[model samples]
Every structure is written in structure tokens, then in C-alpha cells.
Target: MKPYEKLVERFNEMAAEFLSYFPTVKSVGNLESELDKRRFVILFRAMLRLRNEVKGYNEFDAEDLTIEEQRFADYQSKYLDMS
Candidate 1:
């Protein structure tokens, strides 16, 4: 499978494991939503890294990177370590 596909598969597995921690029914649904947000943030960062590696510094301009970095930081700060 493609790298992205593999990442997603692993993420789904992790999400399942993570959700298993929630004993309460109400919390389980909430955790699922939080998991999706975390996954999106993680995948986006991976995509940005892959884009830079494939395109190189010359092709990956500063303005484009700045926008991506801003979004990435926002998501990371919002979702990373979220319970």
C-alpha cells in the first residue's frame, strides 16, 4: 500500500486502541471525534514533510510553506495531547 494509506491504517488501529480506554459510553463517542481531529493534524504534518522532500527547497517556496506551517501549528497546538 501507499505510504499515506499505511499511515491511515495504522492511525485507525491506534484510534481503536485509544478509544478502548474510555469506559463510559458518553465519553467513547467524544473520544472518537477527538481521535479524528488528531489524525487529521498528524496526517497533514506528514503530508507537508513529504511535499517538501519530494519538491525540494527550490520548488517548495516560502509563501506556500508559511501558510502550511501556520495551519499545522494551529492544529498541532489544538489537538496534540488532547484527551
Candidate 2:
């Protein structure tokens, strides 16, 4: 479970990077420049995969650890739809 918590922390750190664009980001064809926009989609989907990898884990039990999982899942999915 400690490892699950550790995994969750790393995912949180990763989320911070792309979350910064939340305010200004627009459609997939808008906002970020072509190169950035394109690569952004790539990494954005990578997060989806990583999220899946995290969910594909188990035997874990903790308080906010569960909250963190749900939180990330929500935020990641919300933004992912934008991508």
C-alpha cells in the first residue's frame, strides 16, 4: 500500500505540469502551437495510460490515498476529454 501511495504521489507531480494550461488551453486545434499541441496530445494520452496502470493496481488501503486516486482520476479524465 505504501508503494501505491508512492505511485499516487508521482502521478500528482506529473499532473501539475499540464494542469498549468487549464485556463488558457482551448480546443485540440487551438491555443498551444502545433508542435506543442501535438506533443501535448501524446503526453496527455500517456497520462491516461498511466492512470490505467495505477488503477490496474490493487491490495491497497489508505485514507486520502483513496481520495488522491479519485481526485487524479477525475482531473485527468476531465482534461483528457479536452485533449
Candidate 3:
């Protein structure tokens, strides 16, 4: 599997987890609060970056899409502020 594909996969995993628990917030105000806003930004940023990376990779030949998937994995697994 290529690095970008791996990134997309893992981001999907995180998105699923977020969706599963997101409704538990119980209030729109709580979901829109500053703390949640921060999380929203970060998650969107990661997903956007992954999307762009995948787009760029798709423009290349299969062999030319070389990258260290672990770096992207680290990005997804990095510390998150779950306030």
C-alpha cells in the first residue's frame, strides 16, 4: 500500500471514531464551543492535508508515489486535545 492511501485509511478511522462519539456531546453549543472548535480545525486540517497528499500522489505513476507512510501515520497518531 502507498503512503497516501494509508493516510486516507487512517483518517477515515479517526473520522469514524469522531462520528461515533460526537453525538454524545448532547448540545450544539457544546459541540460549537471553543474547545470543540479547536478540535474541528485540527481534524479538518489533518484530513485536508491527507486529501491533498492523495491527490498529488494520484497524479504520479505508481512507482513514483514513494513516501514514508509512517510519517503520515505519526501525524494521525499524534497527541489530540480531547477536551
Candidate 4:
């Protein structure tokens, strides 16, 4: 299987867990900031790195990946969606 495919699988798994808390924490905010925004960012950046690497493996410039990462980071830096 492709690396990106594996990532998508893992992402779907984690996204399921994240969505499980959605309804309750939907109202609440700053879960990461309250816990550790820097740590969260570090982990998220790693995820992005993996995604970028996989995109490169597929010979994709990953322009979309860059935009998506920017949007994700921007959202996290602005507020904690945790999704």
C-alpha cells in the first residue's frame, strides 16, 4: 500500500476518535491551549511532515497539502477544534 494510503487509514482512525468528543466539547474551546498548544503543534507538524513526505513520494508537489496544513495550523493557532 502507498504511504499516503496508510496515512489516510490512520487519519480516519484518529478522526473517528476525535469526532467522538465533538458534541460535548463542541462548545468548549482551547483544549490544546489549556493542555499544551506547543505540544499539540509539535505533533501536528509531525503529521504534516508525514503527509508531505507521502505526497512527495507520489510525485505530487503537495501544493494542496501545503494549503491544507496552513489552514489546519491557522485554525489550531486561532482555536482548538481538535479535529
Candidate 5:
């Protein structure tokens, strides 16, 4: 699979993992309630920001990234920020 696809999956997994830590997310379902939707969005954005922080850290640490990496970073910047 492509690197970006892998990254997306990883982000989603990380988001779910984060949500699992919160009791507020228990038994969540689609269109359940406004609060559930809000909680999910909050966690998803947190995970996205976490991913971006890791990428920024790697770039600052002098890790020479591939073109695909740069592309994914740009994609995250464009699509991941919900604010």
C-alpha cells in the first residue's frame, strides 16, 4: 500500500485508540446525538494534530523526508484541520 494510505489508516487507528480511553465514547454510534458527534470530531482532530506534530518533529530532527512524505504532510494540512 502507499505511504499516505498507510498514514491515514494509522491516524484512524490512533484516533480510535484515543477515543477508547474516554468513557464518553462508549457505545458511540452514527447519528446517535450531537454530543457523540462532537466528541468524535474532537478526538479525530486531536489525532490529526498529533500526527502533524510528529511529522514536524521529524522534519526538525533533520530527517530527510521523501516526496510522498511531503505530499502527505500537505494533504494533512489541507484536509485534516477541521477548524
Candidate 6:
């Protein structure tokens, strides 16, 4: 492959792998890395609120909105080493 073409292929592969983390992620526990895991939960959690905006005719999802709090609860438990 040409140099530029190799770069393009590698970049595309990396992008796909990054997005693959979405679905299986429900809380921080899935991210046990202790370091960057502290922040990796950002954009993923943003989607929940953005979706809230998209459907602001309503609010948080899961548990019929009860999930809004549950997501945070996972943090306390997961971080508290309730491991």
C-alpha cells in the first residue's frame, strides 16, 4: 500500500475501534483502568443528556428516568472499590 493509503487505512481502523466501546458500556465498572477511566466516561455520558435534549419533551432514560441517578450510583460503587 502507498504511504498515505496506509495512513488512511490505519486511521479508519482506529476510529471504528474507538466507537465500538459504546454499547457494552453501562457504567464505570466496565472501565476498570483506574487512570483514564476517570475521563473516558465523558462523551458516553453526554449522549444520554444530548438524547434528553433531543427528546427534552422528556428527560433521562432507563428505569423510566430513574437511571439518571443510577448512572452516578455506579460511580460511587465502582470507585469506592466496591469491587
- Candidate with the greatest lDDT versus the true structure: 2
lDDT agreement with native, every candidate: 0.46, 0.56, 0.50, 0.48, 0.48, 0.42
RMSD of 1: 10.3
Better model by lDDT: candidate 2 vs candidate 3 = 2
What tens digits encode model 1's per-residue C-alpha lDDT throughout 1-83? 75544444454454344435532334423545756656555654554455445344344344433234564444345445452
**Residues 4-73 of candidate 3: C-alpha lDDT, one tens digit per residue:** 6676677567656554534332332256567766675476466546556666765433332323344333
TM-score of candidate 3 relative to the true fold: 0.48
Which order, best to worst by TM-score? 2, 3, 4, 5, 6, 1
Identify the superior model by TM-score, candidate 4 or candidate 6: 4
- The count of backbone overlaps in candidate 3 is 0
lDDT of 2 by residue, 1-83 (tens): 57766776766666676566432333333545767666666756766665666666675343423235565455455456646
Looking at model 3, which ten-residue stretch has the lowest summed lDDT? 60-69
Query: What is the full ranking by lDDT, best candidate first?
Result: 2, 3, 4, 5, 1, 6
TM-score of each: 0.33, 0.55, 0.48, 0.41, 0.39, 0.34
Between candidates 1 and 5, name the one with more favorable lDDT: 5
What candidate 2 gets wrong by more than 4 Å, as runs, is: 24-29, 59-83
Instruction: Answer with 1 or 6, whichever has the higher TM-score.
Output: 6
Regions of candidate 6 where Cα sits further than 4 Å from its true position: 1-19, 26-28, 57-83
Write one digit per residue (lDDT tens) for candidate 4, span 26-75. 22344535445454445555555555556666555444343355544454
Q: Tell me the alpha-carbon RMSD of every candidate.
A: 10.3, 4.8, 10.5, 6.1, 10.3, 12.3
